[PDB]
Amino acid sequence: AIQRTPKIQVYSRHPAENGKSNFLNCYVSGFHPSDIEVDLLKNGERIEKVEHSDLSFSKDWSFYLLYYTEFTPTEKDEYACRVNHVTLSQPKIVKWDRDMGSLVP
Amino acid sequence: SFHVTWIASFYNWKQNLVSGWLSDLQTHTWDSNSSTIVFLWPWSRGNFSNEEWKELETLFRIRTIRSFEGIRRYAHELQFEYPFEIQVTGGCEKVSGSFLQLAYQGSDFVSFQNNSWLPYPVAGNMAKHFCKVLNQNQHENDITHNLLSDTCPRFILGLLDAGKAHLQRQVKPEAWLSHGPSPGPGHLQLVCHVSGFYPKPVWVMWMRGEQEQQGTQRGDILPSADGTWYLRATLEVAAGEAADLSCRVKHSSLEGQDIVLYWEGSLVPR
Ligand SMILES: CCCCCCCCCCCCCCCCCCCCCCCC(=O)N[C@@H](CO[C@@H]1O[C@H](CO)[C@@H](O[C@@H]2O[C@H](CO)[C@H](O)[C@H](O)[C@H]2O)[C@H](O)[C@H]1O)[C@H](O)CCCCCCCCCCCCCCC
Numbered sequence A: 001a002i003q004r005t006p007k008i009q010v011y012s013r014h015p016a017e018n019g020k021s022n023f024l025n026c027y028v029s030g031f032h033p034s035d036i037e038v039d040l041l042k043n044g045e046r047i048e049k050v051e052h053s054d055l056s057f058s059k060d061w062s063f064y065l066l067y068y069t070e071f072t073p074t075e076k077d078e079y080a081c082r083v084n085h086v087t088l089s090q091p092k093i094v095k096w097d098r099d100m101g102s103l104v105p
Numbered sequence B: 001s002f003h004v005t006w007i008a009s010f011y012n013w014k015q016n017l018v019s020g021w022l023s024d025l026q027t028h029t030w031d032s033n034s035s036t037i038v039f040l041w042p043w044s045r046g047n048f049s050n051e052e053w054k055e056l057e058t059l060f061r062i063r064t065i066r067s068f069e070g071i072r073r074y075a076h077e078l079q080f081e082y083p084f085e086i087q088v089t090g091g092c093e094k095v096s097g098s099f100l101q102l103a104y105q106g107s108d109f110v111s112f113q114n115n116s117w118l119p120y121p122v123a124g125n126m127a128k129h130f131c132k133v134l135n136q137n138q139h140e141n142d143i144t145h146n147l148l149s150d151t152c153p154r155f156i157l158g159l160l161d162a163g164k165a166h167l168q169r170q171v172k173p174e175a176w177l178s179h180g181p182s183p184g185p186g187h188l189q190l191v192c193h194v195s196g197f198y199p200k201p202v203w204v205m206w207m208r209g210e211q212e213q214q215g216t217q218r219g220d221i222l223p224s225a226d227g228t229w230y231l232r233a234t235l236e237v238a239a240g241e242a243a244d245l246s247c248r249v250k251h252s253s254l255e256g257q258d259i260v261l262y263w264e265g266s267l268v269p270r
């Protein structure tokens, strides 16, 4: 009733280019209560050093956080954000969408 | 608009957060161990002398930890049930507009008006009983009033002046195109990414020549840790009609030189 489920948005700071350093972002917002667990995943495995912004809230009192890490993508790697919150039956996973290319030689 | 936010989460596992903001931009944090006010930028001091800053630190100490203790001492009689969260936001703005509002479990609960705390009607008698506690010292309410109508306007004036350079900087966006993940059958989702721009206002549209494509769906504007902004704009199109399409970005920082990217190369693929 008084609980609100998180919106989860995943994006890169720069276009994906294999072998070039970049930043992966996961913006979690519109949730309540503030207790939340957010992991960034590389090939399904949790990335060890991830930072987040100080917890804040919007006009409607719902909370929001930015999680991010520096990373270098290769063409074989898939990245995602995994969020768990009291409003979620099970952890919700949102993938980083990139083109990658080479659809067929 | 400068404001301070207070986040207190009670589990009786706890957590206490105090931070200061120019709208979207964080300028201050409270370090929960040194009891200091950490300034996140050189200009976060505004034109406030080091000793007036130690005065402010004294009052943030005393009121943050008297507020946490008071909330936990009164929680039984106030019928606050664990777990619960208290959120406060207070600051000043039009012309010299000021505010201080408090929420319980994510809903409007009480606010400070002129000289006293008033309950929001829908919040019921619980909020009313809270105001009684909150109103037990008229002097402490007078201090709150002066923090809002005196200290906050002067501070925000000095802060904006001190930060004018940072706050009025222009950072050029970059953009790029990709395929979107969930097109309907027979259709494509064209995605135009715009990243790294500042300040926030931006214009982005899919185009056919000089014709704006009104199907363009702009996402939320999202933050980056370096203080710039991000936006995705998508267009759903039939697979046959994705040729002459381009993405056009307008931003204050470009001085009329729009970014224009063309759906093509391996994106078609040719
Ligand atoms: C990191 C960011 C930094 C950047 C900032 C840069 C510049 C910013 C400057 C301005 C920006 C905007 C400023 C925002 C304004 C701040 C908000 C207001 C702060 C809290 C308000 C009051 C808090 C407080 O003081 N609660 C004290 C009140 O105390 C009581 O009072 C009475 C007298 O004293 C005593 O009663 C006496 O009892 C006896 C026996 O009965 C006799 O009868 C006496 O006759 C009778 O008087 C009581 O004992 C005593 O308990 C209590 O603990 C608690 C109430 C519980 C909640 C408190 C307020 C809710 C939270 C508000 C915000 C908290 C923190 C926000 C930031 C500080």
Ligand SMILES: *[C@@H]1O[C@H](CO)[C@@H](O)[C@H](O)[C@H]1NC(C)=O
Pocket: B047, B048, B154, B155, B157, B158, B159, B161
């Ligand atoms: C700081 O400078 C601003 C300039 O806009 C001024 O209005 C404000 O009163 C000053 N505050 C001081 C001197 O404390």
